[PDB]
Design a protein around this ligand. Structure first.
Ligand SMILES: O=C(N[C@@H]1O[C@H](CO)[C@@H](O)[C@H](O)[C@H]1O)c1cccc(-c2ccc(F)cc2)c1
Ligand SMILES: O=C(N[C@@H]1O[C@H](CO)[C@@H](O)[C@H](O)[C@H]1O)c1cccc(-c2ccc(F)cc2)c1
Ligand SMILES: *Cc1c(COP(=O)(O)O)cnc(C)c1O
Ligand SMILES: *Cc1c(COP(=O)(O)O)cnc(C)c1O
Lengths: 810, 810
């Protein structure tokens, strides 16, 4: 059909059809009379998987023969979404598979929709791992993603009476055709026991064994025939586990609970034993697997020339004391040589500055569960504080602040401090975030070892986030500047010479209108609700947090509503406000915000005076595959975090790539995005970081804004009096009370400038041609935000490996 | 190589090799450099499975079009063992697959040995289900086996210090290539709740839902292209199950524990809630599946013309009140019409008379878990006792004895009484067993409805139990009388005209010597122990029970030992005594017997005066695939149950088919076997049933035998004094004390006649030619004990369907 989706050769289409029927018969054991669309999806999935395996075996073989340095990306999260369409894109099979299914009388797009998301993540951090894996395969790096195969990923969100309900994401019920169990590479992981000191050093004994069984999933590179491996561990009891008889067999569940469920508490820390078990489990199994590969090439001096270990936040920080444990206790290296090897191998990526996200594990927990790692941690702390004392003699305060061990009622280990100590490189995820790390929470560590601290501004894969989710945009761009940009996104800059081309302006605007018609239709079919596709699509999709200020969006929405009701016969630019995202199940305030959003919808969407001029939709079950649909259909991207709180953001980048303009604060990658597009092509508003600090020093009094802004007083009176909750008049008193007395994130401080900036958005939207020219200037400067740029920078400045764009042979 | 293993055509061998390499590459994602024997087994298993699926789809389609009456075999047990070699036999692929693997440089026999047993059974009852499934496919019946897919089957037995240790049978760790998950045929099962009475009758409400997900396994018929289905249910929680958040997801295990583990308590009843949940789960899911198939042909008058339900003991007795519940509560039939349908549909097979095996469920359990079935059971009891009262007016004792409800501290439901009431046919499993049912435990039920009670003497499939486990014997028989006997075992009678043929006598004896060399070698390789293959192979393999009298065997062994030590320089026929079987984990006495057997071994096997003249081996982990090895290698089959205790036996039949002679009591099928061979070709000894009753009436005083048999006094003094346990001198006082004071099974009563009969066995073994002629007379009369004869009798006399031997088209 369209050029970027590849050739549909007579021979390819004939083979895909033949192999589809072979899998339907042999693999699914069905004939065409009894087959459901689900059987058809599986037959296609097995057919496309067969094109991966030759390249998978060949790539793994090539790494064995060239023996290149290997990158291990350790994360508790891989937010992969669906695999079928991504696999077709990167193998150039999309047009052939579409033709082949068409000739068998099936619609491929209906089959793609049957695949469950691999929801093995919460949000930004897990999705960055997924984009990175795609980018690492596309740039020919010998990279392994290592995680946990959770039986249940992020919960499915249902709204019930406007309230979030959680149900279990049973993504494996029907099977995962993409994974290959490797029960033969099963490894023991130890917990509890105690430490004996011998003549022969320390020995970890009387431990509980849990088995780690790996599952390999292919990670195809973009059209280069490279297929890397994501290896996810699953917990299995040993066969003598407990071994009256019945209860012993049933009690095997206890050990396998380790790989059972993803913790859904995004950007918040709970010190539960089960989470620490998940952290040690992925680290123990992964490091044995790494060390076994390294020995199949005595001497660990070359370990760091052969191994890079990247730590996705502190979640796998135990990699540091575990590498020390293996190298000292099992391999009998002296401490200093083992430490040299550990530091040169490990690198740490920080993903937040919110203090309630930092991992501080109680000592009593580590003492019970990992008694030897607690010993190794104390030893690291002691030698580290001897370096600080020597660097800054007499500074006893710096010693206390920099300690890996915090004093208090409960002593805790600061896992961030452990990572900085044990890593040759610490990076933030946007330039402003990396600067704050050096100015504030890691100032003391920066002053000791300035050489460690780097920036690696985040990115997104233009494979999933443009070719896959927005083919119409990919094609009109490819008509003008070719296909090379898909693996070299800087080439999009060539589109600036088309900013005054009436044909390109028309095509950009037509793709956007098509994506909006298609998404408007998807809201009717699957969720029975009617939206004007001529309206401006105002979308805020991300996890529900106070720092992301969905409430500031709510305040603007109630303002537009109040202005219409005051002057009903005045023209306004019609809008559909879409807000979506999951709340952490115990995060009460996040749950109230979801309920406020649906409550605003119930008032606004059924006011006849309002008409089709304003709609508020809460988008249910926001996940990767819903992002692929709503982001191509957006006109306005809402990136309105309090300055200094969004480490980077990545949704922001997705929307810039897909032809939305951005209303946002000078926070995270928003700064670099405005810098790349020019500030005149960006709806910047509100406090800068420096303004937030000025407010903190004198004190944030929200009552001042209530007193001075009559429009804002009215909204708080509506919330209080039960305008939006007539049955429970006091349903939102927690929100009012938080906004007036306990707002960490200064929603009122940014209200005036936000509403003013939102007026300028509506103004530009009235002039379609200038709106589309501003969009062209955004798409055309979004090149820097490709995860290929990001990974090439990890590769060169942290890992010491040279990316490659060379095809492997087929 | 040998004729019965089929053709190895140039084309077949070429295709098997090509498809083996396709599965190794595409399915297992390995190349020949990294493949383990386990990968090679899986590639072969997938290659053979591909030959099944055409026939599976075709057979299922044929049943849809012909719409024949359907047989549902309901069992909690299917002791299937390995599938690979059985599949090759019934598809005639064994020689081709052996050639195809040979040409790829692999030994098929080493690959067969990597397959785990499907150990979804304890013993005789579960194995009879497996033989039946093979026989039902071979005789062209439209039959479905329905059970539970247990995650852990019968425990793996390890001996440790001569004691049984149990470990978990994790048979699924590496995957099951034979099964096809059918998540789309998932069905709800209800538990707990309570009963509302409306105008519209009774309603079962506020129930807990557990999902039943079916797994289909093919059951190939012998060379007829018929492939029937064994459907096993697995328990899954619903996705709103429990739905703080984490514990709710972890608490899903509670619901899935239903399909987690096989109860290993053979021939003993424990009234645990979890067992009753397993019983209701298989019945609820199975009956919805049956009723859905029946409606895809309003009127339930034709239900019994379309459905037969066979109950493998009382384990699925709830099928009766469940069919009533569906037909009355959901389909709104009146009670009497629903009961007519239920009785005409259901048939009950009794498998024991030991009172401690009968299921008597406490009423408080059924009241909590299945409140509506308890109501339906009371209603059945009331109407049933009105028939008894009318038949036998005034007989108030008969009313009490025949009640489905037993009085006591705990009221109980007698599930046997429920089955007789609710079934048109009740059968025993051997002629003497069926007679005892009518004379004793069901005398009252026989007198009310004599028409219900039948016999169906048990059988074994000559596919697994001769062609598969003993190819050399199958071939020499086929040289003389052709291949037709494999699906018509009565034809073995033609071998009587070869009883005086020097060539056939030599061939029978040579196969036996070959099987003994091969088995003797298997004891060295896998369990490091040395046995004389010229010795008589005396084997007793079956679950360890007191009624099976392994202790009587022990007493003979200690006697042979004591005779050698008294006259060391006297000739004796050398023997290897092999005893094997599992003890139920809580059955203390069974565990002590295993320990006594190993204790006898430690004394006897290391006495230098004894030499290679006597060996006692305990065969570890007795299971189906070990039976396939040891039964072909046996000379003497030990079937020495107290008369009236072994309902039938089936090991007895296996050994008769494979060229062992039988030392046994007049118990179970032993009677029919001696009747078929002639008593002169059988080592019959001990009390008949009538003798046991004479002893019971006057009282069994074991002290009398101790007083009168000096040889027996000596053994009891050796046991007591610690001759066999020098470290713990009183280790066996429980066994001595049971034998002297509490022996339900009269081990001493049969001792004299057993030792005398064992002398006649040794005498005949000294004359090889006459031993082999007696063996020929056994093999040649073992035809009746084919499960094809058994199933043809269920088919004609219970199910009302005509067996067929016609090929389906390929
Ligand atoms: O998700 C995170 N942080 C986010 O990381 C992305 C990617 O760099 C940034 O774009 C974005 O600005 C930033 O908010 C993030 C950071 C620390 C911890 C956790 C976390 C904690 C407990 C859990 F159970 C699960 C997850 C998540
Ligand atoms: O196995 C049985 N009975 C045996 O059945 C076979 C087949 O008909 C006969 O040959 C043999 O003589 C007879 O002993 C049998 C009979 C009742 C209940 C159970 C049982 C109970 C609880 C469990 F948890 C598991 C199983 C097993
Ligand atoms: C990209 C993405 C995110 C991260 O979005 P932010 O706006 O950076 O928080 C979260 N969830 C999903 C499903 C995503 O695709
Ligand atoms: C046949 C068989 C049995 C039944 O043997 P009995 O001697 O009738 O108790 C038990 N276990 C296995 C493994 C069998 O093959």
């Amino acid at each position: 059909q369209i050029s970027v989706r590849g050739l549909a050769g007579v021979e390819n289409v004939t083979e895909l059809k033949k192999n589809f029927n072979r899998h339907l018969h042999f693999t699914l054991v069905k004939d065409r009379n009894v087959a459901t669309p689900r059987d058809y999806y599986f037959a296609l999935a097995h057919t496309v998987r067969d094109h991966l395996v030759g390249r998978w075996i060949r790539t793994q073989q090539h790494y064995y023969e060239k023996d290149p340095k290997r990158i291990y990306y350790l994360s508790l999260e891989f937010y992969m979404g669906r695999t079928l369409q991504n696999t077709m894109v990167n193998l150039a099979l999309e047009n052939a598979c579409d033709e082949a299914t068409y000739q068998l009388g099936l619609d491929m797009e209906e089959l793609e929709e049957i695949e469950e998301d691999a929801g093995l993540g919460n949000g930004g951090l897990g999705r960055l791992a997924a984009c990175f894996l795609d980018s690492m395969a596309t740039l020919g790096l010998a990279a392994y993603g290592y995680g946990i195969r959770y039986e249940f990923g992020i919960f499915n969100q249902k709204i019930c009476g406007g309230w979030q309900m959680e149900e279990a994401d049973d993504w494996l019920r029907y099977g995962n055709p993409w994974e290959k169990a490797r029960p033969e590479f099963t490894l023991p992981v130890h917990f509890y026991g105690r430490v004996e000191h011998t003549s022969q050093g320390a020995k970890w004994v009387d431990t509980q064994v849990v088995l780690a069984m790996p599952y390999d999933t292919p990670v195809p590179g973009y059209r280069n025939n490279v297929v890397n491996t994501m290896r996810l561990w699953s917990a299995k009891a040993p066969n003598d586990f407990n071994l009256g008889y019945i209860q012993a067999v049933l009690d095997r569940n206890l050990a396998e609970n380790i790989s059972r469920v993803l913790y859904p508490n995004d950007n918040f820390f709970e010190g539960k034993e089960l989470r620490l078990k998940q952290e040690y489990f992925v680290v123990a199994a992964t490091l044995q697997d790494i060390i076994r590969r390294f020995k199949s090439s005595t001497n660990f001096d070359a370990f760091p020339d052969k191994v890079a270990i990247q730590l996705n936040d502190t979640h796998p920080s135990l990699a540091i004391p575990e590498l020390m444990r293996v190298l000292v206790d099992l391999e009998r290296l002296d401490w200093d040589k083992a430490w040299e090897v550990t530091v040169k191998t490990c690198a740490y990526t920080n993903h937040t500055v919110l203090p309630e996200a930092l991992e501080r594990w109680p000592v009593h927990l580590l003492e019970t569960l990992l008694p030897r790692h607690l010993q190794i941690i104390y030893e690291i702390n002691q030698r580290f504080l001897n370096r600080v004392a020597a660097a800054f003699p007499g500074d006893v305060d710096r010693l206390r602040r920099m300690s890996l061990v915090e004093e208090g009622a409960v002593k805790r280990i600061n896992m961030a401090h452990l990572c900085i100590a044990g890593s040759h490189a610490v990076n933030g995820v946007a330039r402003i975030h990396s600067e704050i790390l050096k100015k504030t929470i890691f100032k003391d560590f920066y002053e000791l070892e300035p050489h460690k601290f780097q920036n690696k501004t985040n990115g997104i894969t233009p494979r999933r986030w443009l070719v896959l989710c927005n083919p119409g945009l990919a094609e009109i761009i490819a008509e003008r500047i070719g296909e090379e940009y898909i693996s070299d996104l800087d080439q999009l800059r060539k589109l600036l010479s088309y900013v005054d081309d009436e044909a390109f302006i028309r095509d950009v605007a037509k793709v956007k209108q098509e994506n909006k018609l298609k998404f408007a239709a998807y809201l009717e079919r699957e969720y029975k609700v009617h939206i004007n596709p001529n309206s401006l699509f105002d979308v805020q999709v991300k996890r529900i947090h106070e720092y992301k200020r969905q409430l500031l969006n709510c305040l603007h929405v109630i303002t537009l509503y109040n202005r219409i009701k005051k002057e009903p016969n005045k023209f306004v630019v019609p809008r559909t406000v879409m807000i979506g995202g999951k709340a952490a199940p115990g995060y009460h305030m996040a749950k109230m915000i979801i309920k406020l959003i649906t409550a605003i919808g119930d008032v606004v969407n059924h006011d006849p005076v309002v008409g089709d001029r304003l709609r508020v939709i809460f988008l249910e079950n926001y996940r990767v595959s819903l992002a692929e649909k709503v982001i191509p259909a957006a006109d306005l991207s809402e990136q309105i975090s309090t300055a200094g709180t969004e480490a980077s953001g990545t949704g922001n980048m997705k929307f810039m790539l897909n032809g939305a303009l951005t209303i946002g604060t000078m926070d995270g990658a928003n700064v670099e995005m405005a810098e790349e597009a020019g500030e005149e092509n960006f709806f910047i508003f509100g406090m800068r970081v420096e303004d937030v600090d000025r407010l903190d020093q004198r004190g944030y009094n929200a009552q001042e804004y209530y007193d001075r802004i009559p429009e804002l007083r009215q909204i708080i009176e509506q919330l209080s009096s039960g305008f939006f909750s007539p049955k429970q008049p006091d349903l939102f008193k927690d929100i009012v009370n938080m906004l007036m007395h306990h707002d960490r994130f200064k929603v009122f401080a940014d209200y005036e400038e936000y509403v003013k900036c939102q007026e300028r958005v509506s103004a530009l939207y009235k002039n379609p041609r200038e709106w589309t020219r501003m969009v062209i200037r955004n798409i055309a400067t979004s090149g820097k935000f490709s995860s290929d740029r990001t990974i090439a920078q990890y590769a060169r400045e942290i890992w010491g490996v040279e990316p490659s764009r060379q095809r492997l042979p087929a």
